[PDB]
Design a protein around this ligand. Structure first.
Ligand SMILES: [Mg+2]
Ligand SMILES: [Zn+2]
Ligand SMILES: [Zn+2]
Ligand SMILES: [Zn+2]
Lengths: 268, 84, 107, 97, 557, 178, 112, 171
DNA sequence: TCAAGTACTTTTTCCGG
RNA sequence: AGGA
DNA sequence: AAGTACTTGA
């Protein structure tokens, strides 16, 4: 039944998910427009922890002697203290990070940080480190503009929908929303410099890889997502063995849209 | 109706299916004694000849990509990116 | 809008469509004790202008058939006072994308 | 052996469109009928040798196409006809959408 | 092997469903189809100019078709006809016929409700050709009177005249293949109390339906071109050709006629009794008696498993197979012959695991490789290889079974007097044995996954089992307690590309089902991998050097 | 496989009416006044008077001989022999139809030169007559307006007898003196 | 809309209860398919199989002959867009490999 | 009469031809098929015009076989005869039944009865002739005929005609 | 006019006498 | 009547 | 094992 109901569903060349009638089922495959093969459980660091520890991790204040990036972290360090124009970029950055935190907390209400997302950023950084033999002693050759702006740029190229118009462009922004919270959380200035200790080259390479990887991760028009979905529920149903009616018989109850159900219950 | 080259908006990259069907097609054509657009550097299997043709983007084929409405965008195997 | 206590007799109900271009709505006071729109599972629905809809259809190369449907009688379709053919943009949160925008045409 | 419905599903799941066609056609059933372009039926008296085509009761000696369908489908169509249903087969479109 | 045809080859872009007009049936008909006798021209074994080939398709295998010439494999059947003595309901439409009567005037053929009723113009508005008919019926069923004058689209004082006729409409109920009404009546304003009880004849319903306006019937489901309502009532019956009802001709002088061949003879016989009965001194009851039976046979021929109990059982007890029965789900036409099919170039045996096979390979028994064949086109690249496989013949392993020339005809290397001296020409096809590294679809049923059918590299091996790498066990859900697996061989360079490029085992590693890998290290290898990787585990040089050599891609360091 | 046209008509089930073809200017479906060229534009029917037609084919075959040699790189009784040569060069021989056609047009043309066929075409396409009549007027040599109006019965009320007779005079004056 | 959310929640619960994991998208699609109609469309013969998709497609599941008889009676036109129709017709279904078309360009051919 | 018609023939080229002389092979194949052709629908397809500009378009590769299919859009000179058409032609055949007249690619036959009464068959002549008090209709003679009707036949169109009405006959 | 039983419908993994 |  | 549709008395 799951198969025969979903057979004719597939991703079209407009990233839309339609049936044999061309009736839209999903506007973008699985609300994100990604192929599930290219997805991995990743941590959204921005979501959890104390408001205090967030600040320690993410805050750069070039106008405070104890909250500036130490000149040990980057070469610019000494000439960076007090740069008001640069602080406008780090305020921009930190403001966006706090924005993300509140948004993520709206989405995942319990504060669940681990979500399946495309592009394993943890690994790109791991690999950037052995690839470039990152010296956790010497200071980076990165500018704040190099970091802040480079990340802002990479985001514009994380394409999922291509059309030149408001609807499709707003649609692209939407589809990419979460991935960028992750992106922004993992590529914040302090983080890049203090944690990853990346060089400009390492950083440029991390960025290029995220891009390439992301693009690969998108669903292929032609992908027969209907039969996939049907079988992806069908097969696990096969291996199946307060007290509410569950398992095979509840799944049965659900697909039938059974009115006179076995265990009705409210959770007040 | 046929979307103009300057108004195309489908992936600039080649889908898994496109590539599979191109290779299948060239392999079939090569196997049916069609003219080969590249030096077979000792090659004898028509699929391996096809992969060599697609490798040098020396395949004279065009993917006509139909949209749900019925319109379409034509893309050359020369122009499509092969990140697969 | 007629916010009635218990019932509106079938005699009186005959006068509801009797005065167009004006439109009339009947709401049982008890249904409105709680706002359904405020509920966890109930996302932001937005009514689209004739231009906004025309554009949505243009942008996705759609016939009205091809759009997902909201029933005229749907609790939110009633709250918003949706009429047949009117489109709602449903902006929901996503575990996948973060924010996902769906659309529904009225019945 | 049997290439059954569930096997068809996996093939559809993979997107192996040509491999699927091949299983249902070349590897099994595959047959050639001559159909009429007016009343899309298997009616055509194809005397393919003398090159005569014809579909009397259309008087159509001209507008005639050949098609490749599974013999089981040719059968199904003949069955549906025997039962007064006309599964008229057309080689062009009219609806668009 | 079908022959060249000048006709342009096209694909079915649309299927236009409809109903047969008796006129069409008569037009397309290559014969009528007058005698229940199958053949034996007065016992003389050859088809009678009456039933099966009175110009139809052909039997005998030898002896070409009488209308086209082609014969057997090439000749599709040719339809015939039988003119029915009285009109008869098509079983499948009885209720749709009833419902149409329920909607229209059984005297003038006008819709019982129209643009004057509001609820009607509301229901008429409905776009869906089925939902619109559904709403039209619920409204008009209740209307038991064809109205002459209805109140104007303003005042109930001035009643405007629509269509004529006053006539009270019968209250229709079915009595298994028969439609019987119960007209309300009048008699001193009351009556019923005891109404008019008479059965509605096929011919009267036909005549009512014939009078239903194009606009009216088009408002109901119907279409004026392909499906007019009058077509649910059968006047002229299409006779399906022998290919539909083939005679299972066991030996020479012994028939074996199909069920449908017999059921038609029944219809034909039932028709002649009625035809002669009415042309002669019509004993009027003996007529509606002979009519009812024709209605039964034409009914059971299409559908035998009817609500109204009698099951038209063949003299053998066994009930006759309906056409409906043929097409009916899982096993039979749609589901069994079309969505599923028994297929050539397929193999199946017991499966057993191999720790020495690569993940993406499949151990194929020599016998299975020696049977399954791939059609390779003689190209300058393969020309010499293929000539040797051809020379090797069908009995050696790397060999071939057939040589197909450009000139259609297929050379059987097994018997050909020229299996030795056979010079290949470019373009010819050599049907060679399945060889090491060919791509093949390997499957384990049930097939609830796309991974239950993956593409593998052939490895021809001894012993009668399909051998698989153990890590590929899980996706298929196979074990070696006596499981069996299916193997399918592609025939096109195109088809292989689909297998190798889309469904090959390594591609299938990380599945979208759960966004994680669907294959891993199992049993011995998992059990040993723990044992091997403890702090306590140390290996002497002798074994280290062997373990190193064992890695095929080892750097040599 | 045979040839198709610009006329897209959808003959769904409804076979017939295949109404008679006569010079009541009732030519085929295919030979309708409002044709459509491959560019999709509505264009009028092109009817050639044998003299006009001879020049078209000759031109086409001449330009063909040109490309055939380019791709190879890396007095009536006298026009008859000249054409018979071009056919043996450009046409696949087997086309006996074109060989007879050319000879027919060569022995039956009224106007030898392009200059001459020019003026004929102007003179006639001022009348507003249908392409068929405009051709028949150029290909059939008539003296009485009656000769013409009888042979081309379609003309009947379409032109003045005097107007037609003025045309016929000027058509005779254009007539090539072989 | 909330009907969809509960429908997923409830479906998801059956999977996670067994202790299994199915990626969101799959469950979403089923839940969405049941939902897009405007109400709850059952994954039954009297649910989905009674939509406006092609007769041959629909006839392949549960009500076969009855479906085809109705198709005839109401002169239904099969688009031939469904996988199922192409499997019945022995054609390359508009599925992955067959979701586009391949053409030879004489121009690019003479370029090489 | 004699038209210029925009037409299109679908050709199915085998892969072995997907070389540079592909357009050349296609254009040549079109002329093979189309040129010299005869339909009832279009008449005699005589000469394909503008060889240098024949529109080959893109060829769709047919799925199971490698061959590609092009719709070769072209323009040609056609000759489609009609009933009521008055035609000039030369006699060819001549018997006790009538005489056949060659008109371009087609032959129009005139029955002894579709002729005036006076013109009678004279068997005793080399070659057989028809004789009036004024005219002698024989093998080489030029005639003006009114086509009475046409019969669409395979690789031709044959027709019947009169020389009985006014302004028809010998020229 | 509407609740309740009535007719009566329909499916169910894969592969030798 | 059995097999996974 | 659970339905859709239709018909029956308050
Ligand atoms: Mg087992
Ligand atoms: Zn026909
Ligand atoms: Zn035959
Ligand atoms: Zn009436």
């Amino acid at each position: 039944r799951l198969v025969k109901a979903l057979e004719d569903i597939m991703v079209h060349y407009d990233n839309t998910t339609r049936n044999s009638l061309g009736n839209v089922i999903q506007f973008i495959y699985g609300e994100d427009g990604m192929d599930a093969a290219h997805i991995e459980k990743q941590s959204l660091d921005t979501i959890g922890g104390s408001d205090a520890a967030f600040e320690k991790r993410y805050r750069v204040d070039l106008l405070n002697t104890d909250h500036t990036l130490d000149p040990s972290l980057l070469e610019s360090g000494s000439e960076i203290l007090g740069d008001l124009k640069l602080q406008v970029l780090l305020d921009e950055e930190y403001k966006q990070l706090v924005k993300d935190r509140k948004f993520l907390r709206e989405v995942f209400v319990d504060g669940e940080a681990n979500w399946p997302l495309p592009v394993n950023i943890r690994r790109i950084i791991q690999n950037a480190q052995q690839t470039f033999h990152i010296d956790h002693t010497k200071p980076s050759d990165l500018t704040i503009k190099d970091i802040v702006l480079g990340v802002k740029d990479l985001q514009e190229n994380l394409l999922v929908l291509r059309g030149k118009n408001e609807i499709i462009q707003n649609a692209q922004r939407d589809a990419v929303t979460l991935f960028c919270c992750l992106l922004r959380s993992r590529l914040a200035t302090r983080r890049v410099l203090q944690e990853y200790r990346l060089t400009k080259q390492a950083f440029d390479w991390v960025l290029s890889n995220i891009e390439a990887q992301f693009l690969r991760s998108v669903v292929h028009p032609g992908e027969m997502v209907g039969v996939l979905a049907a079988q992806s529920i069908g097969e696990p149903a096969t291996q199946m063995t307060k007290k509410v009616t569950s398992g095979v018989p509840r799944l049965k109850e659900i697909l039938n849209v059974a009115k006179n159900m076995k265990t009705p219950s409210l959770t007040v | 109706k046929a979307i103009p080259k300057d108004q195309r908006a489908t992936t600039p990259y080649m889908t898994k299916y496109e590539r599979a069907r191109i290779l299948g097609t060239r392999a079939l054509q090569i196997s049916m004694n069609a003219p080969v657009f590249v030096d077979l550097e000792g090659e004898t299997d028509p699929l391996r000849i096809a992969m060599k043709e697609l490798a040098e983007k020396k395949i004279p084929l065009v993917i006509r990509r139909y949209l749900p409405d019925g319109s379409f965008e034509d893309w050359s195997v020369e122009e499509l990116i092969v990140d697969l | 809008i007629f916010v009635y206590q218990n019932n509106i007799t079938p005699s009186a109900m005959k006068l509801v469509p009797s005065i167009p271009p004006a439109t009339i709505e009947t709401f049982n006071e008890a249904a409105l004790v709680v706002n359904i729109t405020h509920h966890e599972l109930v996302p932001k629905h937005i009514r689209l202008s004739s231009d906004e809809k025309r554009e949505l259809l243009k942008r996705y190369r759609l016939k009205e058939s091809q759009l997902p449907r909201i029933q005229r009688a749907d609790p939110v379709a009633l709250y918003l006072g949706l009429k047949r053919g009117e489109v709602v943009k449903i902006i929901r949160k996503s575990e996948t994308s973060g924010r996902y925008a769906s659309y529904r045409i009225c019945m | 052996l049997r290439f059954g419905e569930m096997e068809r599903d996996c093939m559809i799941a993979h997107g192996a469109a040509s491999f699927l066609k091949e299983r249902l056609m070349e590897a099994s059933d595959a047959f050639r009928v001559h159909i009429c372009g007016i009343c899309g039926l298997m009616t055509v008296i194809a005397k393919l040798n003398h090159n005569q085509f014809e579909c009397k009761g259309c008087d159509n000696k001209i507008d005639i196409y050949q098609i490749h369908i599974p013999y089981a489908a040719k059968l199904l169509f003949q069955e549906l006809m025997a039962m007064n249903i006309t599964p008229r087969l057309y080689t062009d479109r009219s609806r668009d959408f | 092997g079908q022959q060249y045809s000048s006709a342009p080859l096209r694909t079915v872009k649309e299927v236009q469903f409809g109903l047969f007009s008796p006129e069409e049936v008569r037009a397309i008909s290559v014969a009528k189809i007058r005698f229940p006798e199958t053949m034996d021209e007065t016992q003389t074994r050859a088809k009678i100019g009456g039933l099966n080939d009175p110009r139809l398709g052909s039997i005998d295998r030898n002896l070409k078709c009488q209308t086209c010439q082609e014969g057997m494999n090439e000749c599709p059947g040719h339809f015939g006809h039988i003119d029915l003595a009285k009109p008869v309901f098509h079983v499948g439409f009885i209720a749709k016929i009833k419902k149409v009567c329920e909607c229209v005037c059984m005297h003038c053929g006008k819709l019982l409700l129209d643009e004057h009723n509001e609820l009607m113009r509301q229901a008429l508005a409905i776009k869906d050709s089925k939902k619109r008919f559904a709403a039209i019926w619920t409204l008009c069923k209740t209307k038991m009177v064809c109205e002459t004058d209805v109140p104007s689209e303003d005042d109930p004082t001035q009643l405007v005249s629509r269509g004529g006729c006053g006539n009270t409409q019968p209250t229709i109920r079915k009595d298994g293949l028969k439609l019987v009404g119960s007209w309300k009546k009048d008699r001193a304003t009351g009556d019923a109390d005891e109404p008019e009880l008479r059965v509605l004849s096929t011919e009267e319903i036909l005549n009512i339906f014939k009078h239903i306006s194009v606009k009216d019937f088009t408002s109901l489901g119907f279409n004026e071109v392909f499906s007019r309502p009058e077509w649910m009532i059968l006047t002229c019956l299409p006779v399906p050709p022998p290919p539909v009802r083939p005679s299972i001709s066991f030996n020479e002088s012994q028939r074996g006629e199909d069920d449908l061949t017999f059921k038609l003879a029944d219809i034909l016989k039932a028709n002649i009794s009625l035809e002669t009965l009415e042309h002669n001194g019509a004993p009027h009851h003996a007529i509606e008696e002979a009519e009812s039976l024709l209605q039964f046979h034409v009914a059971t021929y299409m559908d035998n498993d009817i609500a109204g109990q009698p099951q038209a059982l063949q003299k053998s007890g066994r009930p006759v197979k309906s056409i409906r029965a043929r097409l009916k789900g899982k096993e039979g036409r749609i589901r069994g012959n079309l969505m599923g099919k028994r297929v050539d170039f397929s193999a199946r045996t017991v499966i057993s695991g191999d720790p020495n096979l690569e993940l993406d390979q499949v151990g194929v028994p020599k016998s299975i490789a020696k049977t399954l064949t791939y059609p390779e086109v003689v190209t300058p690249y393969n020309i010499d290889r293929l000539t040797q496989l051809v020379r090797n013949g069908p009995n050696e392993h790397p060999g071939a079974k057939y040589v197909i020339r450009d000139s259609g005809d297929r050379i059987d290397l097994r018997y050909s007097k020229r299996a030795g001296d056979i010079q290949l020409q470019y373009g010819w096809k050599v049907e060679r044995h399945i060889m090491d590294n060919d791509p093949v679809l390997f499957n384990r049923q049930p097939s609830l996954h796309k991974m239950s059918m993956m593409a593998h590299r052939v490895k021809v091996i001894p012993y009668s089992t399909f051998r698989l790498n153990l890590s590929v066990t899980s996706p298929y859900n196979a074990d070696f307690d006596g499981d069996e697996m299916n193997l399918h061989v592609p025939q096109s360079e195109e088809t292989r590309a689909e297998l190798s490029q889309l469904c090959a085992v390594p591609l299938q590693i990380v599945s979208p089902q759960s966004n994680k890998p669907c294959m891993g290290i199992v049993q011995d290898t998992l059990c040993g991998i723990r044992k091997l990787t403890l702090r306590d585990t140390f290996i002497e040089l002798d074994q280290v050097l062997n373990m190193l050599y064992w890695v095929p891609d080892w750097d040599g360091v | 496989v045979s040839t198709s046209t610009f006329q897209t008509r959808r003959r769904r089930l409804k076979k017939v009416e295949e109404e008679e073809n006569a010079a009541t200017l009732q030519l085929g479906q295919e030979f309708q006044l409002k044709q459509i060229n491959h560019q999709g534009e509505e264009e009028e029917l092109i009817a050639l008077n044998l003299s006009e037609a001879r020049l078209v084919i000759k031109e086409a075959l001449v330009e063909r001989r040109r490309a055939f040699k380019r791709s190879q790189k890396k007095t009536r009784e006298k026009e008859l022999e000249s054409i018979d040569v071009l056919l043996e060069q450009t046409t696949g021989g087997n086309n006996k139809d074109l060989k007879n056609t050319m000879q027919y047009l060569t022995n039956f043309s009224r106007f030898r030169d392009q200059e001459t066929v020019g003026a004929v075409i102007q003179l006639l396409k001022s009348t507003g007559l249908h392409p068929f009549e405009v051709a028949q007027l150029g290909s059939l040599a008539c003296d009485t307006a009656d000769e013409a109006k009888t042979l081309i019965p379609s003309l009947n009320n379409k032109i003045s007898d005097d107007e037609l007779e003025r045309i016929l005079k000027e058509l005779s004056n254009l007539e090539t003196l072989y | 809309e909330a009907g969809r959310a509960a429908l997923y929640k409830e479906v998801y619960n059956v999977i996670a209860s067994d202790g299994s994991y199915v990626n969101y998208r799959h469950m979403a699609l089923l839940v969405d398919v049941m939902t897009t109609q405007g109400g709850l469309t059952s994954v039954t013969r009297h649910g989905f199989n009674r939509s406006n998709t092609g007769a041959l497609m629909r006839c392949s599941f549960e009500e076969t002959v009855e479906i085809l008889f109705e198709a005839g009676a109401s002169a239904e036109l099969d688009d031939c867009r469904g996988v199922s129709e192409n499997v019945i017709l022995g054609q390359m279904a508009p599925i992955g490999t067959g979701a586009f078309d391949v053409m030879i360009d004489e121009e690019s051919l003479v370029k090489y | 009469m004699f038209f210029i018609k925009d037409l299109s023939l679908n050709i199915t080229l085998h892969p072995s031809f997907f070389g540079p002389r592909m357009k050349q092979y296609l254009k040549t194949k079109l002329l093979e098929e189309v040129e010299g052709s005869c339909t009832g629908k279009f008449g005699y397809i005589l000469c394909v015009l503008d060889y240098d500009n024949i529109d080959i378009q893109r060829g769709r590769i047919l799925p199971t076989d490698g061959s590609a299919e092009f719709n070769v859009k072209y323009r040609a000179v056609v000759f489609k005869p009609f009933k009521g058409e008055v035609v000039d032609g030369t006699v060819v055949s001549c018997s006790q039944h009538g005489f056949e007249v060659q008109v371009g690619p087609m032959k129009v036959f005139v029955t002894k009865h579709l002729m005036p009464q006076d013109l009678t068959f004279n068997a005793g002549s080399n070659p057989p002739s028809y004789q009036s008090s004024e005219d002698v209709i024989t093998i080489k003679s030029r005639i003006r005929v009114k086509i009475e009707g046409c019969i669409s036949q395979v690789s031709s169109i044959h027709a019947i005609g009169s020389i009985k009405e006014d302004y028809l006959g010998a020229i």
